[PDB]
Amino acid sequence: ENLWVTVYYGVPVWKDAETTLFCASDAKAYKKHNVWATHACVPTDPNPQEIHLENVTEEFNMWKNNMVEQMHTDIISLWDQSLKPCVKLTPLCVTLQCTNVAITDGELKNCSFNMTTELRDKRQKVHALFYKLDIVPINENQNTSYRLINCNTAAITQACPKVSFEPIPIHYCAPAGFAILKCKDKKFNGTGPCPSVSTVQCTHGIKPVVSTQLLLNGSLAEEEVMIRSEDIRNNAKNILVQFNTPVQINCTRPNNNTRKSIRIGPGQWFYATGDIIGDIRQAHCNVSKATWNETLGKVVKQLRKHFGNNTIIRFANSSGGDLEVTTHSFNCGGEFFYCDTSGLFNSTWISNDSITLPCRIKQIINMWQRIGQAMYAPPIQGVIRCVSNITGLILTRDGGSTDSTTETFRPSGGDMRDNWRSELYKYKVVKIEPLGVAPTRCKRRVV
Amino acid sequence: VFLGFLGAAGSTMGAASMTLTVQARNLLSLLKLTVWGIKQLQARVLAVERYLRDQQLLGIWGCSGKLICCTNVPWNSSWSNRNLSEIWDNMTWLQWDKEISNYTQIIYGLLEESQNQQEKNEQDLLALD
Amino acid sequence: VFLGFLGAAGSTMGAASMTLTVQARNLLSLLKLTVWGIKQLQARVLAVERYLRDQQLLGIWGCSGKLICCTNVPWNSSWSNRNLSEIWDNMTWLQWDKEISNYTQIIYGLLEESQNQQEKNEQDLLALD
Amino acid sequence: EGQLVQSGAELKKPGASVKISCKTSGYRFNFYHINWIRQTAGRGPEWMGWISPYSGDKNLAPAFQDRVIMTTDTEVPVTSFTSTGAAYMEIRNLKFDDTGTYFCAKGLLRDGSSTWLPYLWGQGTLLTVSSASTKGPSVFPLAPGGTAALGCLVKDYFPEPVTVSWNSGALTSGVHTFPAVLQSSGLYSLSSVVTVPSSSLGTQTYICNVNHKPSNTKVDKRV
Ligand SMILES: *[C@@H]1O[C@H](CO)[C@@H](O[C@@H]2O[C@H](CO)[C@@H](O[C@@H]3O[C@H](CO[C@H]4O[C@H](CO[C@H]5O[C@H](CO)[C@@H](O)[C@H](O)[C@@H]5O)[C@@H](O)[C@H](O)[C@@H]4O)[C@@H](O)[C@H](O[C@H]4O[C@H](CO)[C@@H](O)[C@H](O)[C@@H]4O[C@H]4O[C@H](CO)[C@@H](O)[C@H](O)[C@@H]4O[C@H]4O[C@H](CO)[C@@H](O)[C@H](O)[C@@H]4O)[C@@H]3O)[C@H](O)[C@H]2NC(C)=O)[C@H](O)[C@H]1NC(C)=O
Ligand SMILES: *[C@@H]1O[C@H](CO)[C@@H](O[C@@H]2O[C@H](CO)[C@@H](O[C@@H]3O[C@H](CO[C@H]4O[C@H](CO[C@H]5O[C@H](CO)[C@@H](O)[C@H](O)[C@@H]5O)[C@@H](O)[C@H](O[C@H]5O[C@H](CO)[C@@H](O)[C@H](O)[C@@H]5O)[C@@H]4O)[C@@H](O)[C@H](O[C@H]4O[C@H](CO)[C@@H](O)[C@H](O)[C@@H]4O)[C@@H]3O)[C@H](O)[C@H]2NC(C)=O)[C@H](O)[C@H]1NC(C)=O
Ligand SMILES: *[C@@H]1O[C@H](CO)[C@@H](O[C@@H]2O[C@H](CO)[C@@H](O[C@@H]3O[C@H](CO)[C@@H](O)[C@H](O[C@H]4O[C@H](CO)[C@@H](O)[C@H](O)[C@@H]4O)[C@@H]3O)[C@H](O)[C@H]2NC(C)=O)[C@H](O)[C@H]1NC(C)=O
Ligand SMILES: *[C@@H]1O[C@H](CO)[C@@H](O[C@@H]2O[C@H](CO)[C@@H](O[C@@H]3O[C@H](CO)[C@@H](O)[C@H](O)[C@@H]3O)[C@H](O)[C@H]2NC(C)=O)[C@H](O)[C@H]1NC(C)=O
Ligand SMILES: *[C@@H]1O[C@H](CO)[C@@H](O[C@@H]2O[C@H](CO)[C@@H](O)[C@H](O)[C@H]2NC(C)=O)[C@H](O)[C@H]1NC(C)=O
Ligand SMILES: *[C@@H]1O[C@H](CO)[C@@H](O[C@@H]2O[C@H](CO)[C@@H](O)[C@H](O)[C@H]2NC(C)=O)[C@H](O)[C@H]1NC(C)=O
Ligand SMILES: *[C@@H]1O[C@H](CO)[C@@H](O[C@@H]2O[C@H](CO)[C@@H](O)[C@H](O)[C@H]2NC(C)=O)[C@H](O)[C@H]1NC(C)=O
Ligand SMILES: *[C@@H]1O[C@H](CO)[C@@H](O)[C@H](O)[C@H]1NC(C)=O
Ligand SMILES: *[C@@H]1O[C@H](CO)[C@@H](O)[C@H](O)[C@H]1NC(C)=O
Ligand SMILES: *[C@@H]1O[C@H](CO)[C@@H](O)[C@H](O)[C@H]1NC(C)=O
Ligand SMILES: *[C@@H]1O[C@H](CO)[C@@H](O)[C@H](O)[C@H]1NC(C)=O
Ligand SMILES: *[C@@H]1O[C@H](CO)[C@@H](O)[C@H](O)[C@H]1NC(C)=O
């Protein structure tokens, strides 16, 4: 009947905490120096240990998750670390005089301009092809002298040609004393109590696929397709969608471009586009209309579960923002594509003929809302073609005072973090507090 | 019977108290200026810092070598009124830590003062002869 | 009665020896390349390095768990000739450490060798049967 | 600190079957056995069985091993430490001596020497086994220190029970409901009275609300 406190060291007790995670990737061997894997990420253990926690029920919140905020700052910081040593194209802001590529009734333009040479006193005139988006006319009156789009706002640096932009699986690990809780509930929505929970030291192979509008190469939701949002009632917050069946999308750049290596200084090398060899075709992606119409129908079924079992569900193209947010932007073999998705979100729902999408390309880009530094993607030699998985989406309501009679859904890409949340919805970081004090009928011996 | 790290987190406190070794093991174990290197090194220093703090508390409570140690501090009923069967056969360490997280700091202070600071002086005066 | 960290630094050695827990507690507890970050991380590594060194000495003296431990080493009078009342009721740990800082290294060597290196082999031969 | 709410009373003819439900909340439904105990006038209290929501193991007393089927649904989580659930008991081959009150009960401890011991009990479900048909009640007014008493008389109803409220539950003080009488005909009758100050005739209107769910009849009588 006399109770005394006793210290237990190693009690399964944890508390919500945010710590500094680190990198971990398999032992992939090779060209290399891919930005994300870096020179050294801790190689994944030959065998990971996933330990299911019986009887455990933990509250999750993918929208207040700090793993997202950390990953975001890691991608940004990794990008800058790879641009620092590469060649900066400060002298490439010389006035450009551009002409058309002949044809009657032009996305790319043939530009001639003078560029410095190895020797300070000598100069050289070189001709290189450019895309319309990367250039603006220096007159508007108009004459026809053009300049690079970035020279007015921020400097520019050329991405090194060796580093590759292909995402590889990356595992986010937590330090000793902390742990990661994975929600294995198939039907798990955005937030809430997860009945089935397990613990792991590192996450699964998460590929840092930077996309917009459409989610590519992600992980497929099990069982039914999932509709995740922070506030379905609030139109302002985006809507994450995860497919149970992946749709296939083929993007190609049929032009047989060429790489022109023009030295612009001692050691500095600039890689310009070389006249195209062969026909002049524009890049485009294909999607099977049967699968997409089927996949889009499965989405509207889960959509009605939150907007009434019967309601008008239409789809329109992006009507807000410009440039990145209006086009399904992404990377493919080193070239940055920008596709018009009006053909995919152009339906209305109530109660082998593959779709084609126009894609334009740029070589000067400012990703992640970066203000101050632009990057020049060196031209990729040969024909480019990449087959990717479209696993998720990012939608948004139009809002307004419509009496709930009809609901409209448009794509968007407001923030880059939503891409990370599409793969970090199931994980959570907690710290282990192994000191527990409890009363027992034991007493220390006075001896 | 081993379930793995934190396997008994949903079990009763009595069942979890049997596998404290499991949590004890996995509790500690040209330019290197990469973003990963700075994160890793800072993560490693954070892990040993937390481990040494808990081992520090066990040291000042005279319980360094053991996972289960008994003390001289009596259980003040204001902390919890639950009987032994209700505590050890009806509650998990999680919901227990939540019920007593309020008085943990007070309990830790009594745990370092009441015994091991009194015990060591009395141990010298006892083995003094 | 608690005065705080190092509160009894000017008190007699006997009075200071009562609050050793106080010193024991507070004895351990895009680019992060800032001058502060490098200083902090290097400071944190320095703190755990000093703590582990003192705990290392307590380990090799068989006194790991305790703040007050008795040994087998007899007090050689050449170190200090002062009686117990004069040491513990007339001197502070500061002026004591100054009077014995001269022979501390010799004393530490006898402290690790004389007992715990002899004690452990004799402990195996004693519990051998 | 959780409540178990059982389904309403039912009248069934002998030979038929009936399924009683027991919805839980305020605790982890998965962590405690759900027991089923009944009380009849002929045999007193009688333990029927329990079932584990976690594993599904059931233990039925031999007297009900061949006529009772116990099932449970999966818990719907609310917080990390609480959830909502539901357990069911289907009893078949009903007899007249099976008429009585049935209870579901939550176990005592998750572990120990008496884990399943019924600790938290529901409000009970009244089961009547009879060949007679349901009959709705007839409600009559009971005409009325300066205090007085008034109420409503519920005469000739079947089966039990009948619930009485005042002013749609707004009037609870001074209410006195009396147990029912068992007429020689086999029908029940009860009375309900409320004590009020006699001066409160110009400011208070007393409405007695009689609900007899077995006949699906409601009666709102102004006294
Ligand atoms: C979503 O996920 C999808 C699933 O993966 C992604 O789809 C991926 O799309 C990317 C493009 O965006 C593809 O990468 C590129 O594929 C090109 C086509 O691959 C063909 O050739 C393969 C060669 O075979 C070798 O490798 C295979 C691998 O298993 C091996 O079995 C075989 O034995 C052999 O060793 C063949 O296997 C394939 O089946 C195809 O037929 C490929 O050519 C690209 O490689 C280029 O480019 C990358 C990045 O730019 C560089 O890292 C490479 O080193 C290589 O670049 C070198 O070669 C070029 C060839 O013209 C040159 O132009 C370059 O200048 C360069 O040459 C220099 O370097 C050499 C090496 O040091 C030197 O020898 C030279 O002298 C030069 O100095 C690239 O891999 C993926 O293949 C594709 N995935 C799959 C599974 O197919 C999709 O992109 C994802 N979506 C998003 C948005 O991320
Ligand atoms: C997660 O949480 C859940 C829920 O909180 C928790 O599950 C509880 O776990 C505890 C402890 O493990 C259980 O409490 C123990 O239960 C033991 C099982 O009860 C026995 O009796 C059942 C009835 O048997 C009769 O009926 C059958 C016909 O059905 C008949 O043939 C028999 O002869 C007999 O008459 C029986 O069905 C049941 O069988 C299950 O269990 C065995 C393993 O034992 C398994 O092999 C079977 O397949 C089946 O799943 C079982 O045999 C009980 O024995 C035990 O009592 C002994 O142990 C305690 C120590 O715990 C001693 O003190 C005691 O003196 C006895 O020696 C104890 O009562 C509890 O019932 C579970 N369910 C709850 C609480 O709802 C999980 O363990 C948690 N897990 C984690 C990882 O956290
Ligand atoms: C593009 O999308 C398609 C969509 O299906 C995708 O194909 C699937 O990839 C998965 C892996 O991500 C394949 O699943 C694995 O297949 C291998 C070989 O058969 C098995 O050994 C694996 O077994 C286990 O792992 C599973 C989890 O992945 C566990 O659930 C299971 O318990 C086992 O431990 C695993 O099943 C899958 O087979 C294909 N689908 C088909 C039809 O082949 C494709 O990978 C995507 N492309 C890219 C580049 O990502
Ligand atoms: C972009 O503009 C440049 C001009 O600055 C074009 O380069 C010139 O292209 C003509 C083809 O119309 C070349 O004519 C050929 O010249 C070679 C010289 O060896 C000769 O052997 C052939 O018989 C023919 O006359 C011309 O040489 C070339 N000039 C230079 C300096 O390279 C370029 O073709 C234009 N490209 C596009 C896509 O518009
Ligand atoms: C995901 O599911 C959970 C259910 O556990 C939802 O949480 C409840 O949400 C409703 C409104 O949607 C609130 O009224 C409840 O109070 C919430 N319960 C708890 C315990 O938080 C959650 O809203 C769902 N999220 C989405 C985006 O649908
Ligand atoms: C793209 O154009 C290049 C030419 O620059 C083609 O490469 C040539 O291919 C032929 C084969 O028909 C070889 O005989 C030549 O030696 C190659 N020359 C060079 C410089 O590579 C390439 O095949 C073309 N690719 C496509 C898809 O049309
Ligand atoms: C995207 O390209 C892949 C392959 O380049 C296509 O998959 C082929 O589909 C046809 C059926 O039309 C099969 O006969 C081939 O065997 C498939 N090839 C491979 C490698 O799987 C896919 O159909 C294309 N999708 C679209 C929308 O054009
Ligand atoms: C190129 O350089 C020459 C010599 O410096 C100069 O005369 C000519 O105007 C320049 N042309 C262009 C287009 O810059
Ligand atoms: C959106 O669709 C309209 C047709 O209604 C079209 O004119 C417009 O160019 C499209 N804009 C984008 C950004 O897709
Ligand atoms: C949408 O589909 C209609 C009907 O086929 C077509 O007329 C229209 O051009 C399409 N619009 C877009 C933006 O794709
Ligand atoms: C914890 O302590 C706070 C402050 O005394 C009190 O308000 C709260 O109710 C307590 N909750 C617990 C211990 O259940
Ligand atoms: C300390 O030791 C040195 C060297 O033996 C000696 O010169 C000095 O006088 C001593 N001082 C003390 C211990 O008071």
UniProtKB/TrEMBL annotation, chains B, C:
This is Transmembrane protein gp41. Residues 98-129 form a coiled coil. Glycans are attached at residues 76, 83, 90, 102. Residues 1-15 are annotated as: Fusion peptide. Residues 13-129 form the Retroviral envelope protein GP41-like domain. It is found in: Virion membrane; Host cell membrane; Host endosome membrane. Disulfide bonds join 63-69. It is a single-pass type I membrane protein. The chain crosses the membrane at residues 1-18.
